[PDB]
Scaffold this motif. Structure first.
Motif: not given
Lengths: 52, 46
Positions: B6-20
């Motif tokens: 959970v802490a290491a995830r604060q550094l990670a870019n999330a892949t965001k989709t366009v709204p479905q």
């Protein structure tokens, strides 16, 4: 409905015609500028018998 | 003990989709019709 006549262009053209007529009328009749109101004393002549 | 997820995830870019949009359909009829242009919005069928 802009074939073969541009509707916006015709509306603008007609609008500008009416505004140009109003502009000529203002050049003659305006209260601020306007020839009939900016006539000097001594330049106003009266007809002797009405008819020109 | 070490660095947690959970802490290491604060550094990670999330892949965001366009709204479905679930109401999208293939709209087959529009793709199957033949389309005629009307240059001045009036079509008179003699």
């Amino acid at each position: 409905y802009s074939n073969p006549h541009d509707q916006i262009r015709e509306q603008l053209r007609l609008t500008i015609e009416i505004m140009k007529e109003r502009q000529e009328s203002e050049l003659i009749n305006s209260r601020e500028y306007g020839l009939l109101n900016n006539v000097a004393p001594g330049q106003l002549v009266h007809t002797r018998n009405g008819a020109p | 003990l070490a660095l947690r997820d959970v802490a290491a995830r604060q550094l990670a870019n999330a892949t965001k989709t366009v709204p479905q949009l679930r109401t999208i359909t293939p709209r087959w009829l529009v793709r199957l019709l033949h389309w005629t242009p009307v240059e001045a919005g009036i079509y008179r069928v003699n």
